[PDB]
Design a protein around this nucleic acid. Structure first.
Lengths: 389, 114, 111, 33, 96
RNA sequence: GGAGUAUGGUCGCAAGGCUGAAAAAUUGACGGAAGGGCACCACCAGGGGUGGAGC
């Protein structure tokens, strides 16, 4: 009830920083303008359910209008066998409903940056009708492949080792009828809980972009779609790079309940450019419209153009993974860590994250020239509960 | 060799049907390969696509017809329906009567099927 | 958006320009700690009003005057100069309440 | 098409493990025996 | 090890802290990291109740073990400058 | 040092999607009519339950 926020922008960032700092928040006026569907969105209320499920002692209170919530956070326990599940290796089930338009990386990015600060492991299993493992048009969410091999190496940079991260899909799905729907189930297993993340330093220039590797996925369409997409993306990137290599993945169709239906018919592509210097990777994704039927070569050219855009633009980390690396840099020890952002990278979401950290109680950021070096002072919180044996 | 080709009722996309047991669906304005349909064991004898261009039926010599969706070209259901090599297929063009996604198929076993 | 990116990366001189412009363990541990302790005080030695005041707080060793608002008046009435005043800084975690699980043992000389 | 990578590059990229960044009968005696 | 008689170390992690039976040697053994050379070796705390004085990241002197896991060669002698048998006998308190 | 037997790691193969859920036969498939055998799940002669009230 104490701290006060307004608006529906950066909602998951506000709740996750509230959980990590232990500061009780109160977010008012979610949808004041919308007369048709005011209040909380279904993906937002399902993220509230997931946050209650993985935490312990957190009290979430949604109002009668649905336009104001308050949130007194508790500790991030994870899957302990006395409170959350029955066994320590058991996956906590989470179902998200059929009226869900955002991708599953909308749930995975806050959970993956809230997961190294837990007590036990995290073994979340996202099932249900509305679990889209693809990119959305939506708010342009990342795919599962983009999310995995673009942002989990950043935890590898921080010292949360990716030897113990297990993000695996069991079915894959796109949106289907309109934006709503899904069907493809995932499970994420964080077994690498750290006390304090390392204060990293991204300062040297990530000049030579050495190679491009990627994933083109097709669920419900012909398997020549990814071959045509690979020929389009190679026709764009062969002017620049000799080694572009894009895996092809194909799944038949996922079935949801109504008597089951096959939903999530679509196809998309996800390129990742690896710089020879360090853990610096630029990613881009593009998905078919869930009703449109556009050319796969158009999609391959579109994702290659977005990848060359991000390679032109980015200093060290792209703006999709910049809030995650900046909030982990803030969670680290009481030293300064230095990120090298591009001047084009700075975004209203990044700026809103800065405003939220200043409101919560972290120190401000120091911006100097080198693209600009942003330097963040850690707050030294870490994780609160861990059994020091 | 092109065995059978048909247009779209809204003149947007073309569809040829080869001897290589495959179907190539092209765009009408510039002749760029929109997609290709596979999975026929024997060469395609005929095809007919729907009035709103959301369906293709494709009649082959391997004694079945295929229904494709024409966005992403996913086979809706391969349905084995004749005892011999199905010569021709045809949609009814008007959905004024509420039945525009129905189609006839005529085969070498002396049968038409609605 | 899409068509703007299509023109901006269909201009081939832009593509060629981007192709040109882009494509003793104890003492070692103590030295890494001192390297971090030089990296800060090398990194917030760049500006006064922003870094030295707002980023790095109020640095240690400097004499400082604190204004605390809302002290109960019994402290000012029962203030003796003998018993000193220790001001400590609570962390973000040190203001939360909950069940602390501790490992305890009675003292050797407690009866 | 030359996009087919290798089994080793498939093992690093398309697996569940994310790629870390910190890698780059002569003689009669023997015949009788 | 080395050329000396006792080595120092950092207690990385008390392996076998969740073992069931009380005086198991897997319960008594502790993975430490030697300072001088940098390698992680395993050492026996002499007693299961004496395991509680060994905390994580503590400077630990260890010697040879001369006589259930045969082959763990070292035993923890001092923890943070105080003898471990003295801590067990409750002669001294551990300076932390 | 040789020969067996185990135990736990490490590596290599397995581990690349004309794809998208619901035959065999000269020996095989199914019957019919006639004639037998058996049966307190049949006939015949009797007996006994349950089923009506309450637990």
């Amino acid at each position: 009830e104490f701290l006060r926020f307004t608006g529906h922008r950066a909602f998951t960032q506000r709740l996750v920083l509230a959980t990590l700092y232990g500061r009780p928040i109160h977010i008012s006026k979610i949808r004041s303008s919308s007369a048709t569907n005011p209040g909380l969105a279904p993906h937002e209320i399902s993220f509230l359910r997931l946050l209650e499920s993985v935490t312990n002692g957190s009290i979430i209170d949604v109002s009668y209008s649905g336009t104001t919530i308050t949130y007194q956070p508790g500790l991030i326990t994870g899957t302990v066998p006395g409170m959350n599940a029955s066994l320590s290796s058991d996956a906590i089930e989470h179902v998200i409903p059929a009226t869900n338009t955002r991708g599953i990386t909308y749930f995975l990015i806050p959970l993956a940056l809230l997961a190294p600060f837990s007590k036990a492991h995290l073994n979340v299993r996202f099932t249900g009708p509305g679990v889209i493992t693809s990119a959305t048009h939506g708010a342009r969410d990342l795919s599962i492949d983009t999310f995995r091999t673009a942002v989990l190496p950043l935890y590898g940079l921080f010292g949360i080792p990716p030897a113990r991260i297990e993000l695996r899909v069991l079915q894959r799905s796109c949106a289907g009828p309109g934006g709503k729907g899904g069907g493809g189930i995932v499970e994420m297993r964080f077994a690498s809980q750290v006390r304090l993340p390392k204060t990293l330093h991204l300062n040297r220039r990530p000049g030579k972009v050495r190679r491009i590797r990627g994933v083109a996925y097709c669920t419900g369409v012909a398997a020549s779609h990814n071959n045509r997409m690979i020929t389009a993306a190679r026709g764009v990137l062969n002017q620049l790079v000799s080694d572009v290599h894009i895996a092809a993945q194909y799944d038949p169709a996922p079935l949801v309940a109504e008597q089951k239906k096959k939903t999530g018919i679509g196809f998309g592509l996800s390129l990742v450019a690896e710089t020879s210097a360090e853990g610096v990777i630029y990613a881009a994704d593009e998905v078919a419209p869930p009703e449109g039927g556009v050319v796969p070569e158009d999609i391959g050219e579109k994702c290659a153009y977005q990848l060359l855009d991000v390679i032109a633009q980015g200093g060290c980390v792209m703006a999709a993974s910049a809030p995650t690396v900046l909030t982990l840099m803030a969670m680290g020890s009481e030293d300064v860590g230095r990120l090298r952002l591009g001047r084009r990278v700075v975004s209203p979401e990044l700026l809103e994250l800065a405003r939220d950290l200043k409101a919560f109680g972290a120190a401000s950021w120091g911006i100097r020239d080198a693209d600009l070096i942003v330097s963040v002072k850690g707050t030294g919180v870490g994780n609160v509960g861990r059994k020091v044996a | 060799d092109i065995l059978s080709l048909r247009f779209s009722p809204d003149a947007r996309l073309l569809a040829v049907a080869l001897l290589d047991s495959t179907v190539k669906v092209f765009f009408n304005d510039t002749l760029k390969l929109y997609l290709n349909l596979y999975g026929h064991k024997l060469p395609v004898l005929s095809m007919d696509i729907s009035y709103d261009s959301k369906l293709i039926v494709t009649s082959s010599a391997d004694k079945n017809i295929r229904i494709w969706g024409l966005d992403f070209g996913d086979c809706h259901k391969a349905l084995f329906g004749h005892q011999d090599s199905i010569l021709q297929v045809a949609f009814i063009p008007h959905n004024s009567d509420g039945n525009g996604h129905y189609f006839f198929s005529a085969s070498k076993d002396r049968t038409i099927k609605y | 958006d899409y068509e703007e990116l299509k023109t901006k990366w269909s201009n081939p001189e832009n593509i060629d320009a981007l192709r040109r412009t882009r494509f003793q363990w104890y003492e070692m541990q103590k030295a890494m700690l001192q390297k971090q302790l030089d990296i800060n005080k090398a990194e917030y030695a760049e500006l006064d009003e922003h870094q030295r005041r707002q980023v790095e707080g109020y640095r240690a060793g400097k004499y400082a005057r604190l204004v605390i608002e809302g002290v109960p008046a019994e402290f000012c009435k029962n203030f003796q100069p003998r018993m000193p005043i220790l001001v400590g800084g609570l962390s973000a975690t040190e203001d939360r309440f909950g069940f602390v699980q501790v490992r305890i043992k009675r003292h050797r000389w407690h009866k | 098409a030359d996009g087919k990578m290798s089994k080793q590059e498939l093992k690093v990229y398309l697996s569940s493990r994310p790629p870390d960044p910190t890698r780059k009968p002569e003689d009669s005696a023997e015949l009788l025996a | 090890f080395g050329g000396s008689s006792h080595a120092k170390g950092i207690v990385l992690e008390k392996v076998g802290v969740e073992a069931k039976q009380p005086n198991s040697a897997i319960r008594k053994c502790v993975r430490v990291q030697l300072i001088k050379n940098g390698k992680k070796v395993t050492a026996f705390v002499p007693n299961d109740g004496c395991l509680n004085f060994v905390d994580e990241n503590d400077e630990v002197l260890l010697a040879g073990f001369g006589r259930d896991i045969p082959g763990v060669r070292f035993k923890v002698v001092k923890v943070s400058g105080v003898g471990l048998l003295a801590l067990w006998k409750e002669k001294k308190e551990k300076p932390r």
